Symmetry: C2
């Protein structure tokens, strides 16, 4: 009896709370499996993916720089991932490899779980990389009043996201709204003592969402604390995105109950 092999592929990979998460899920749902980080150089993405399909890989997450490039390899891609323009989850089957995006699903679980409403609210996104693509598709799918994308490079970014209001950090300081979301790397190692915005900016919103989960409170989120703004870090998203991958790989459903439990465990492990 073979052990199912699952993992994450990226070009260079560091430590990750995701693996531990997957391994907890395998125990809880009774899957005999491992989840490894696989470093794969750019010129070899296609050949490695072919071998994964050959050894019957149980399922792969994909990160940078392969979320778009990997799409070349898939015989099919979900509607959501197509729209988002990036795949972070690969399902292997008889036909070959198909693609999904479970950042979108994770982000939605996080808003529900802390009850952050979106529909009819004014939503502000900080940064245009990392998970901004999936977060912007979600906000729009859910009928935000308006969506701002705030960038260090307004000329570049507004070519990229033409249907959203793109603005500079300067312009943001004149804006008031409901929900403000950090999609930038400020606040996480090695930029941990930084915030993407000032507290006076944070103070004009009624919910602050950081997709960073370590540290569990970024400067950005402290700021939100001090100002009376509901604060959410990205731990629930990480745990939900991993549950959702496993759902698609193993064609199962994972109880919300398994998710909070993994969440509580990881939250402690991270704060320690």
């Amino acid at each position: 009896l073979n052990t199912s092999i699952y993992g994450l592929i990226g070009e260079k990979l560091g430590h990750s709370h995701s693996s531990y998460i997957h391994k907890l899920i395998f125990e809880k749902v009774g899957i005999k499996g491992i989840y490894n980080l696989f470093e794969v150089p750019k010129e070899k993405l296609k050949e490695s993916v072919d071998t994964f399909k050959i050894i019957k890989c149980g399922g792969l997450n994909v990160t940078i720089p392969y979320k778009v490039e990997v799409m070349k390899e898939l015989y099919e891609i979900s509607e959501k991932a197509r729209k988002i323009g990036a795949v972070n989850t690969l399902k292997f089957s008889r036909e070959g490899i198909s693609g999904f995006n479970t950042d979108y699903i994770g982000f939605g679980k996080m808003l529900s779980k802390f009850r952050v409403e979106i529909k009819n609210n004014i939503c502000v996104v900080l940064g245009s990389g990392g998970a901004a693509r999936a977060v912007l598709q979600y906000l729009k799918d859910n009928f935000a009043k308006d969506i701002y994308v705030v960038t260090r490079n307004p000329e570049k970014t507004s070519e990229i996201y033409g249907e959203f209001k793109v603005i500079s950090y300067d312009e943001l300081s004149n804006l008031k709204g409901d929900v403000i979301i950090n999609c930038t790397p400020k606040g996480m190692y090695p930029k941990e003592g930084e915030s993407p915005v000032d507290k006076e900016v944070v103070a004009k919103f009624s919910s602050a969402v950081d997709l960073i989960y370590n540290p569990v409170e970024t400067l950005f989120l402290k700021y939100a604390r001090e100002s009376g703004v509901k604060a959410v870090n990205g731990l629930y998203m990480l745990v939900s995105q991993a549950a959702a991958s496993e759902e698609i790989w193993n064609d199962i459903s994972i109880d919300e109950i398994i998710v909070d439990e993994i969440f509580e465990v990881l939250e402690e492990k991270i704060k320690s």
Copy 2:
């Protein structure tokens, strides 16, 4: 922290008691890994091993039909593997894949374990496929007096002969490397009891069943009968020592031997 991925590469693979052997080794020595059976089609050998290299595979055993073909992809090969002409073990390092033969080591560990002397004795090998290659290298390395290889068809280094000629012969060690005696050939023996009786040790590389018809003939004729189970457990361990650059005590090998021995019979 990653689990090290080990296993076996070949084209078409049955179940193997090998994967359970490697798991036991992992547990008894304290290694975190898994050992899978990996089915690779011929056109994908190069690509597959190149991928394993990239994902830092902890090491691979190689079976039919790649023991010869895999040798193209190696940067070094032990001189024993090179003499035998076959690689069944692959070691991955930063410099590349390195090739060994642990069927040789395992056959040697099995004969020492059961005290089957080779020096200056007449040795007959039945079948000129399977690991007939490593067995034959080992007999020569250990100064057999003579070596015969018996084949269904001599027209298809040592003396080669038909079964018809084997029946005029008395020797010391008789070794089965044919698939006769193992499913689906359980009801049969590559040779007659009357032949087996003319030897003083009978070794079957087959380990399931744990007593083939050939070995029953040997038991009944007062001939030392040895099945291939100890060799299969020793080859796994020798592989693990190579991949993990460790030493594994004979005690462990002896422990897994007994487990598999009971499991095989149950079946």
